[PDB]
Short mmCIF file of C-alpha atoms and ligand atoms in Angstrom, two decimals:
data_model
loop_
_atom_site.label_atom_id
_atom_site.label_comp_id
_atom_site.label_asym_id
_atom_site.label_seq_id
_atom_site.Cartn_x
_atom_site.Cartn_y
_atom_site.Cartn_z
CA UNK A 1 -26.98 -14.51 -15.87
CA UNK A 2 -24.90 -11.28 -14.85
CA UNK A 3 -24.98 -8.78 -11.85
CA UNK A 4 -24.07 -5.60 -11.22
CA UNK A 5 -23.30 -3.80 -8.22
CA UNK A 6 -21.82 -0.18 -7.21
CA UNK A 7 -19.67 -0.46 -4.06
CA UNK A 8 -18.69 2.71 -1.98
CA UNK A 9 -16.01 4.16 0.21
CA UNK A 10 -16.68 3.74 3.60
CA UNK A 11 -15.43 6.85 4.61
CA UNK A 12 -12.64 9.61 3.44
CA UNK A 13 -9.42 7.71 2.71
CA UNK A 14 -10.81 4.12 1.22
CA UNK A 15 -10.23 2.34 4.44
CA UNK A 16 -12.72 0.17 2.78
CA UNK A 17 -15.85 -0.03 0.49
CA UNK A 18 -19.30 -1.52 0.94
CA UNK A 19 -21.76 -2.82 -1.54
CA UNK A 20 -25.41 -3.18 -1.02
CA UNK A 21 -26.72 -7.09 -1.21
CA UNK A 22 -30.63 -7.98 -1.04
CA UNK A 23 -30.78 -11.51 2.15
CA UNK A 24 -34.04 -13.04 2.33
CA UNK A 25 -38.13 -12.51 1.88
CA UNK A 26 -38.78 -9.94 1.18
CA UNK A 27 -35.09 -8.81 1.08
CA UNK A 28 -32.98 -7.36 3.65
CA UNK A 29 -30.67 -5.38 2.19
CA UNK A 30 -27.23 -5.37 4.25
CA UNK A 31 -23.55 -3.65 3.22
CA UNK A 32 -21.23 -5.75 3.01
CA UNK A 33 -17.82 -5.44 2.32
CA UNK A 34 -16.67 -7.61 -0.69
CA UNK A 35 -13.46 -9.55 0.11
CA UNK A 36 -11.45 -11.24 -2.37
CA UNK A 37 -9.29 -12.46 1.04
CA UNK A 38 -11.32 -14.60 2.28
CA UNK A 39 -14.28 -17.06 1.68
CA UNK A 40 -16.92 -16.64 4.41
CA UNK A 41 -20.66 -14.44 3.70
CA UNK A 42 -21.16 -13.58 7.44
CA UNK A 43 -23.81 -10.94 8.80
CA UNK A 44 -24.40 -8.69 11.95
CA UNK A 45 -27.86 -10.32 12.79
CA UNK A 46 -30.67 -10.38 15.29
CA UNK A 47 -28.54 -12.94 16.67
CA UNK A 48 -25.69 -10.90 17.35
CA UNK A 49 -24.83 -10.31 21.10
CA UNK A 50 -26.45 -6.75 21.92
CA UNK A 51 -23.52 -4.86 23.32
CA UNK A 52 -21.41 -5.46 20.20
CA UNK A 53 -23.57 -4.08 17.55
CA UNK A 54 -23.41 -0.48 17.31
CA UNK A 55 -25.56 0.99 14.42
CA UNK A 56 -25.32 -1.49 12.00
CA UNK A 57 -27.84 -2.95 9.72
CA UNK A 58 -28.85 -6.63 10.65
CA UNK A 59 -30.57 -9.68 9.25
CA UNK A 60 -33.18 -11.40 11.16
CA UNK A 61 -33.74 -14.64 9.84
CA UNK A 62 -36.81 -15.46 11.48
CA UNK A 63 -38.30 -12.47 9.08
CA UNK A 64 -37.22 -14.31 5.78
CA UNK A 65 -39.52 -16.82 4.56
CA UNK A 66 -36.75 -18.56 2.60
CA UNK A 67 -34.39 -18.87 5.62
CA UNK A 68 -33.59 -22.23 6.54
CA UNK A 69 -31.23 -23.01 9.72
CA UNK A 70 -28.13 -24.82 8.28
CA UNK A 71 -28.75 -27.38 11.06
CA UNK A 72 -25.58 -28.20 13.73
CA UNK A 73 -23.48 -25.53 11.38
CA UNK A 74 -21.05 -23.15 12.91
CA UNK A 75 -18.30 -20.52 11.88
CA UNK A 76 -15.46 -18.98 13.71
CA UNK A 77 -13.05 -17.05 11.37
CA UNK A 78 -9.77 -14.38 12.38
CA UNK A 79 -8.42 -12.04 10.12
CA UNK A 80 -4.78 -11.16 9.44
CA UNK A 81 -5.38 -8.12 11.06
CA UNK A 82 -6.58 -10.26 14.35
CA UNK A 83 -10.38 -8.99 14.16
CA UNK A 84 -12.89 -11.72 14.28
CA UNK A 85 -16.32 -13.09 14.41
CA UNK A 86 -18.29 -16.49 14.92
CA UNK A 87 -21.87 -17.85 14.87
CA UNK A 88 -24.19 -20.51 13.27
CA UNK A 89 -25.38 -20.36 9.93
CA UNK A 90 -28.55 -20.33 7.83
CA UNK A 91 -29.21 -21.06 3.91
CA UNK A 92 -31.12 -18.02 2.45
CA UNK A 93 -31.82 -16.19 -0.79
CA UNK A 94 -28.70 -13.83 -1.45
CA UNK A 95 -28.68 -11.30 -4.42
CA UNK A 96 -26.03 -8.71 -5.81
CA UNK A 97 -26.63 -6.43 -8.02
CA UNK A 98 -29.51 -8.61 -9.95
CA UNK A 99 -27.55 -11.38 -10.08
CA UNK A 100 -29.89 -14.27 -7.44
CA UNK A 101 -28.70 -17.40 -5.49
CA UNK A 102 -30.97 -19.63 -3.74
CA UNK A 103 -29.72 -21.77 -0.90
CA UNK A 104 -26.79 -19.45 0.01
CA UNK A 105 -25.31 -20.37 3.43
CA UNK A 106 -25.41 -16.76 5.01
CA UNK A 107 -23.26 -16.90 8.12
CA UNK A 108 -25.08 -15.51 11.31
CA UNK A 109 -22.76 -13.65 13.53
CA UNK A 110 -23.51 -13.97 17.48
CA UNK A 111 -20.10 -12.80 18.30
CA UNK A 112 -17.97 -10.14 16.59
CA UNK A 113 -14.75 -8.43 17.65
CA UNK A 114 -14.50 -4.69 18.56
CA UNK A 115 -13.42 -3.54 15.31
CA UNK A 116 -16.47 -4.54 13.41
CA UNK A 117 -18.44 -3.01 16.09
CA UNK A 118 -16.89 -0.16 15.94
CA UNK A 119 -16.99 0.04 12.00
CA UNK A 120 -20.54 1.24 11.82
CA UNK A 121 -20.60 1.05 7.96
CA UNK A 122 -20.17 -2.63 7.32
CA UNK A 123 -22.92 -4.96 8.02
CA UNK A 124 -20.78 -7.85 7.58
CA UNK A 125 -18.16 -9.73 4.62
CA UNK A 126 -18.97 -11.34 1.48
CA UNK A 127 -15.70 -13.60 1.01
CA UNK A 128 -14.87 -13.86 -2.64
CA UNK A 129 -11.51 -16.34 -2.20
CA UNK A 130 -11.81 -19.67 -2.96
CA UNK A 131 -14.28 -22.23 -0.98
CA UNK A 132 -11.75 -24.07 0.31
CA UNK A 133 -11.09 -21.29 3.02
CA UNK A 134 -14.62 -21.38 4.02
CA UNK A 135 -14.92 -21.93 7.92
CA UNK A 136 -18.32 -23.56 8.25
CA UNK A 137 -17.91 -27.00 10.18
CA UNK A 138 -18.88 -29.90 9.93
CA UNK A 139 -19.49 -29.29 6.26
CA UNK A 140 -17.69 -26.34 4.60
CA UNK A 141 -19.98 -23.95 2.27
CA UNK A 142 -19.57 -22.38 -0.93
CA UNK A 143 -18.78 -18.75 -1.53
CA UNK A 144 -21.25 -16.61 -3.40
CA UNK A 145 -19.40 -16.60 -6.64
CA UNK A 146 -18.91 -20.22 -6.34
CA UNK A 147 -22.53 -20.97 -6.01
CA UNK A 148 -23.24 -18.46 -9.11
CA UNK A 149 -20.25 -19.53 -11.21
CA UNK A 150 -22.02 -22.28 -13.42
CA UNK A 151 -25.24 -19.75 -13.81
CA UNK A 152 -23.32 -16.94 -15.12
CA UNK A 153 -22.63 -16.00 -19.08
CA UNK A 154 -18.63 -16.26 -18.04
CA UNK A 155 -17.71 -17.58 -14.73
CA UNK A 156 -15.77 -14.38 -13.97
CA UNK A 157 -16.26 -11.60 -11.66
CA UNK A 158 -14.14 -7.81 -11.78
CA UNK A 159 -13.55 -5.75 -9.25
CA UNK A 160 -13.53 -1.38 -10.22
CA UNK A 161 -12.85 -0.12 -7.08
CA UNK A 162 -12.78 4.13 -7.00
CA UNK A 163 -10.28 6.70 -6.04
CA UNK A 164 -12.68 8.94 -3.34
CA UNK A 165 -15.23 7.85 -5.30
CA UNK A 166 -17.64 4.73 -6.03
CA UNK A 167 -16.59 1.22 -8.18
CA UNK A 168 -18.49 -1.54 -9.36
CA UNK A 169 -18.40 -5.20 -8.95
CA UNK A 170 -19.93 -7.34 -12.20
CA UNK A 171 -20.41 -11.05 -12.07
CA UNK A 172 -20.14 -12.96 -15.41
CA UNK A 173 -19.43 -10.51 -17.76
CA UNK A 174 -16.09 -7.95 -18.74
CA UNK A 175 -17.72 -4.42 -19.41
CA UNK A 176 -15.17 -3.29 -22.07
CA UNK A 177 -16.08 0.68 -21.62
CA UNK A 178 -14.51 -0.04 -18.37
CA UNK A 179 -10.87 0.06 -19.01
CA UNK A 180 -8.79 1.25 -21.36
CA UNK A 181 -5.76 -0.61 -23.48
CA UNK A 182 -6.08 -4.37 -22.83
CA UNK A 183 -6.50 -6.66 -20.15
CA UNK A 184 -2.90 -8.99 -19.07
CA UNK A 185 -4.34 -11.91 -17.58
CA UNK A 186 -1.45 -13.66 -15.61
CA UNK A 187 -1.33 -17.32 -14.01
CA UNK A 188 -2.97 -17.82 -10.36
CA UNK A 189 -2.04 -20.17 -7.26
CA UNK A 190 -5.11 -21.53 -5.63
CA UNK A 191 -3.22 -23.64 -3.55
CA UNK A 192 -3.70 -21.14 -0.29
CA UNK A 193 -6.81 -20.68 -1.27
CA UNK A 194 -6.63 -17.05 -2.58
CA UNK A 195 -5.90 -15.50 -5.87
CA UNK A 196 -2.00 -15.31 -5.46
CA UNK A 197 -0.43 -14.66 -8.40
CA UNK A 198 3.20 -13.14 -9.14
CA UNK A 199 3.86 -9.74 -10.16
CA UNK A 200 7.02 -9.11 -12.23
CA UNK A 201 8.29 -6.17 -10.46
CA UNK A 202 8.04 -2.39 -9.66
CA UNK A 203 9.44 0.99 -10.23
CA UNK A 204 9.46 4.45 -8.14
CA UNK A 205 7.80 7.46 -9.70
CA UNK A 206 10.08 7.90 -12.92
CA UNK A 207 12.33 5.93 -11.95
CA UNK A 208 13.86 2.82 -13.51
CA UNK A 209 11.39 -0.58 -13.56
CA UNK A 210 13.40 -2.93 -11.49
CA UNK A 211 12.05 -6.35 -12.63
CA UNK A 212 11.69 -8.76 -9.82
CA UNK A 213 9.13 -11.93 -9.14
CA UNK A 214 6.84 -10.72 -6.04
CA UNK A 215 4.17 -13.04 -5.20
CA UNK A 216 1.40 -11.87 -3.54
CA UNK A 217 -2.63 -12.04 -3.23
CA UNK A 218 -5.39 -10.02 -5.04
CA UNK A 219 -7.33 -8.70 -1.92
CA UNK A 220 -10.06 -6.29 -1.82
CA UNK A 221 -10.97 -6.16 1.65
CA UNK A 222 -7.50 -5.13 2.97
CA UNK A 223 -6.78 -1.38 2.46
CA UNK A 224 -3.43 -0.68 1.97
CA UNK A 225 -0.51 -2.30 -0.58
CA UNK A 226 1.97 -4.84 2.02
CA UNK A 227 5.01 -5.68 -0.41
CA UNK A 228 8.60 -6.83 0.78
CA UNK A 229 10.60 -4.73 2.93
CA UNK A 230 12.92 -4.05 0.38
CA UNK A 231 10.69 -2.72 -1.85
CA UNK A 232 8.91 -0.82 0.75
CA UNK A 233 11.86 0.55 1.79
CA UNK A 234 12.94 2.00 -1.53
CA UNK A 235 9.62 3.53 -2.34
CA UNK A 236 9.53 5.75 1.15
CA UNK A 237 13.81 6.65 0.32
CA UNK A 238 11.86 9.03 -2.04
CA UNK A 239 9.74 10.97 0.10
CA UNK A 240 12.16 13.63 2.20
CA UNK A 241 11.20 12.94 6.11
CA UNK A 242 9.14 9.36 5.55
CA UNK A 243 10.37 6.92 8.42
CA UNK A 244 8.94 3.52 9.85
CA UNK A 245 7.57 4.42 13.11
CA UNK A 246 7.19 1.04 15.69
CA UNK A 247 5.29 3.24 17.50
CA UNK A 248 2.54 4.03 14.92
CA UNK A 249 2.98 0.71 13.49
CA UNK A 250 4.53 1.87 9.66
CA UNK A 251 5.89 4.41 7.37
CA UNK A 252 4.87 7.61 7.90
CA UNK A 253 5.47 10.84 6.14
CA UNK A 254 5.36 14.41 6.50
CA UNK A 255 1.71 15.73 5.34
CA UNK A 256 3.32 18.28 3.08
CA UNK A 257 5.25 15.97 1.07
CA UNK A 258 3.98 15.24 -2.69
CA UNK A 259 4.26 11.42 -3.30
CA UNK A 260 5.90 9.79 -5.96
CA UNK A 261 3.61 6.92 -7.95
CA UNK A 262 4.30 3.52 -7.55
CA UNK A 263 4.17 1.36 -10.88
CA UNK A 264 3.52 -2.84 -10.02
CA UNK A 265 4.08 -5.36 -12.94
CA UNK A 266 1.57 -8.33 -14.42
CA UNK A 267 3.49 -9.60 -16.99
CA UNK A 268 4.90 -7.30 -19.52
CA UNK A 269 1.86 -4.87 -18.52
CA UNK A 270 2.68 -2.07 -16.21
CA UNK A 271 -0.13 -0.34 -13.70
CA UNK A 272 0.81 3.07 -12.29
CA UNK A 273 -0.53 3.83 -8.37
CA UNK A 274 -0.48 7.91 -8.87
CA UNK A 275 1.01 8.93 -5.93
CA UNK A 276 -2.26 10.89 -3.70
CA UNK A 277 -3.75 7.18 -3.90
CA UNK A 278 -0.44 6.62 -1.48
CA UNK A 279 -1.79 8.97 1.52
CA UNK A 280 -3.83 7.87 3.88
CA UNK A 281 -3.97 11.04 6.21
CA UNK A 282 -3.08 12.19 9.22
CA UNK A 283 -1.75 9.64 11.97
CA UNK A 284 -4.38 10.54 14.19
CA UNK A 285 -6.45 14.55 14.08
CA UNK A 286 -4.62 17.25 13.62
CA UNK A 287 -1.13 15.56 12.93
CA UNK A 288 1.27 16.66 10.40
CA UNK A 289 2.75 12.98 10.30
CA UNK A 290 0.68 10.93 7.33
CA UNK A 291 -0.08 7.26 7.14
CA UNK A 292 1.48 5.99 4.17
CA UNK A 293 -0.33 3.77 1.86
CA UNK A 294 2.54 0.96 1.10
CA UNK A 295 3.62 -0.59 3.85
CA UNK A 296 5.67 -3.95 4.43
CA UNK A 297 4.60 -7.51 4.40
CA UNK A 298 7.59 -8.80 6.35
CA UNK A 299 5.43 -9.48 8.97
CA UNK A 300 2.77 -10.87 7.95
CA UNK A 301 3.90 -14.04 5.59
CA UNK A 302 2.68 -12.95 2.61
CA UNK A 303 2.84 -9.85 0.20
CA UNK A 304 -0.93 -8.25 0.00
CA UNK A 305 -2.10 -6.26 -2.95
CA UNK A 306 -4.90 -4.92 -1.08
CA UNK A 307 -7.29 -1.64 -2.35
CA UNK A 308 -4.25 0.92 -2.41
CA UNK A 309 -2.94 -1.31 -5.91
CA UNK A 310 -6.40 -2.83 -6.75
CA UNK A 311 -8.31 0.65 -7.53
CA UNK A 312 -5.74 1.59 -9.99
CA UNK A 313 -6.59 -1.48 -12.08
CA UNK A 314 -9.77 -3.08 -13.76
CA UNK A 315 -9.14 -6.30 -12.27
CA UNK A 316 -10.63 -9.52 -13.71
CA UNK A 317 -11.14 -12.45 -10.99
CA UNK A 318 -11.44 -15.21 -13.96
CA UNK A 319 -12.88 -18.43 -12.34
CA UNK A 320 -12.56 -21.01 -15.10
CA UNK A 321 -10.77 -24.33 -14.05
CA UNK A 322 -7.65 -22.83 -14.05
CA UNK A 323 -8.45 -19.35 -12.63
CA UNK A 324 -6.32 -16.47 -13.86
CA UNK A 325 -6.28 -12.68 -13.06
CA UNK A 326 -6.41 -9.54 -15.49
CA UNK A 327 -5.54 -6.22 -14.93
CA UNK A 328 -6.16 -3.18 -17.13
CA UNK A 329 -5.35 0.48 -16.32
CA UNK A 330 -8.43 2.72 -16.87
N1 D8J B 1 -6.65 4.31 8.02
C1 D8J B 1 -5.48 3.38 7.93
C2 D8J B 1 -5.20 2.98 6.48
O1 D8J B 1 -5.37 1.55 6.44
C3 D8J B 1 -5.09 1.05 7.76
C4 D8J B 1 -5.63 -0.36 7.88
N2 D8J B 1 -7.05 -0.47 7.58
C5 D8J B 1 -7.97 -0.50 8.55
O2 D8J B 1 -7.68 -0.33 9.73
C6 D8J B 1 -9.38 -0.77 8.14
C7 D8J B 1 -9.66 -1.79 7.24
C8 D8J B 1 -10.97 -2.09 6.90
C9 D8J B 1 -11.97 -1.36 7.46
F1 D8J B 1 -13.25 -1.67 7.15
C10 D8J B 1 -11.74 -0.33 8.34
C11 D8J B 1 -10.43 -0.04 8.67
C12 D8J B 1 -5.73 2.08 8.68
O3 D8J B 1 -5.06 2.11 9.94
N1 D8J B 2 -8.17 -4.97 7.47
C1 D8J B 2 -7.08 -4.27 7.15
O1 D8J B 2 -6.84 -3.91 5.99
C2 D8J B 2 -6.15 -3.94 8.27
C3 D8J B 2 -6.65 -3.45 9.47
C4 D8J B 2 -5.81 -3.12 10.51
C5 D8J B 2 -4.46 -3.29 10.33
F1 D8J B 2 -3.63 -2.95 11.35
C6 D8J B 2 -3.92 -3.78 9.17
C7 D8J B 2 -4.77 -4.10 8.14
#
């Protein structure tokens, strides 16, 4: 089997992208926002306590005739960025893009913090990391992909995220009019449970390729590119005015600047961030100050390559026994 599935820009600057997926019978169709980052399919849901849903879509189990209550199951996850959500859980019907699962434990949310209620757009997260991050106790449940792996033609999925514009997610096949030269598949650490993998360095606009081992994780649902501090710091040296602000919490740049590209390594292979992909706007409305689109990891514990590096790629999330990852400029 294969499925197929166009996800969309939230909003303006690719804060972050949503993808339609069919819960249920008849379906409910909710957006949810893929996330290579983490492992947990959670929903806004009749369930959901009333003053913290604020026009999203919701599923209501007792509508599905295939819902089943995942009996004494519960789920309390926090994100790196200190949102979070919790509920119980229910096994239903889950489809993306054509691609069906039966028995799907679809996390019901009864509690969600203010960001996701104030994110109107997303419905809730499809977690596409490895199971083993799943937060379901007593007994831990498989992530979509997992539970479609050993159905699929190839037990891969690739993410084609757009600049402005909508990407596509496919599960079990490569489309090859999707990229152009080849695809450099390079090794992957599971042991963290995400697709962490080691890039082999980075250059500056046209500047010299400085090669350098920076391991990091393959995330679609973070937004912007978190890389050492070093690295960080001699990517904004090239923009006249950038600065690290404590008070707006990163690098930011004068609005009139032109950015220079960044260029990441996988293997020999290079892919080239063009510079716009780089500006995320004004600080707040009206602003001449910019929020820059690399920003440093140093304190969060790990190096993120999150949808600023991601949607210059064609990225290949290969799930054989040993997973691997392959990039391809297109
Ligand atoms: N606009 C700036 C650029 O990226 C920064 C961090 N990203 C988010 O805050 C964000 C992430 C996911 C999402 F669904 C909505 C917002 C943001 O301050
Ligand atoms: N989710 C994100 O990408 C994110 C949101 C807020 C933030 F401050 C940093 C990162």
């Amino acid at each position: 089997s294969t499925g197929s599935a166009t996800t969309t820009p939230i909003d303006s600057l690719d804060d972050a992208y949503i993808t339609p997926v069919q819960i249920g019978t008849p379906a409910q169709t909710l957006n949810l926002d893929f996330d290579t980052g983490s492992s947990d399919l959670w929903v806004f849901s009749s369930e959901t306590t009333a003053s913290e849903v604020d026009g999203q879509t919701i599923y209501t189990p007792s509508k599905s005739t295939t819902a089943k209550l995942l009996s004494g199951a519960t789920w309390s996850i926090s994100y790196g960025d200190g949102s979070s959500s919790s509920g119980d859980v229910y096994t239903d019907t889950v489809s993306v893009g054509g691609l069906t699962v039966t028995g799907q434990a679809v996390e019901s949310a009864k509690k969600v913090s203010s960001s996701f209620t104030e994110d109107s757009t997303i419905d809730g997260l499809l977690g596409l990391a490895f199971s083993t991050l799943n937060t379901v106790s007593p007994t831990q449940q498989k992530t979509f992909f997992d539970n479609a792996k050993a159905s699929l033609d190839s037990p891969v999925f690739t993410a084609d995220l757009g600049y402005h514009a909508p990407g596509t997610y496919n599960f079990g096949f490569i489309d090859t009019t999707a990229y152009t030269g080849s695809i450099t598949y390079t090794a992957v650490s599971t042991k963290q449970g995400f697709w962490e993998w080691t890039s082999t360095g980075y250059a500056v606009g046209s500047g010299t390729f400085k090669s350098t081992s920076i391991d990091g994780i393959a995330d679609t649902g973070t937004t912007l590119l978190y890389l050492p501090a070093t690295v960080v710091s001699a990517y904004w040296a090239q923009v006249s005015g950038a600065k690290s602000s404590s008070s707006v919490g990163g690098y930011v740049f004068p609005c009139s600047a032109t950015l220079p590209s960044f260029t990441f390594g996988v293997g020999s292979a290079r892919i080239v961030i063009p510079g716009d992909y780089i500006d995320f706007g004004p600080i707040s409305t009206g602003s001449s100050s910019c929020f820059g689109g690399i920003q440093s990891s140093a304190g969060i514990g790990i190096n993120i390559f999150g949808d600023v590096a991601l949607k210059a790629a064609f990225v290949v999330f290969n799930g054989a026994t040993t997973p691997t990852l392959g990039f391809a400029s297109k």
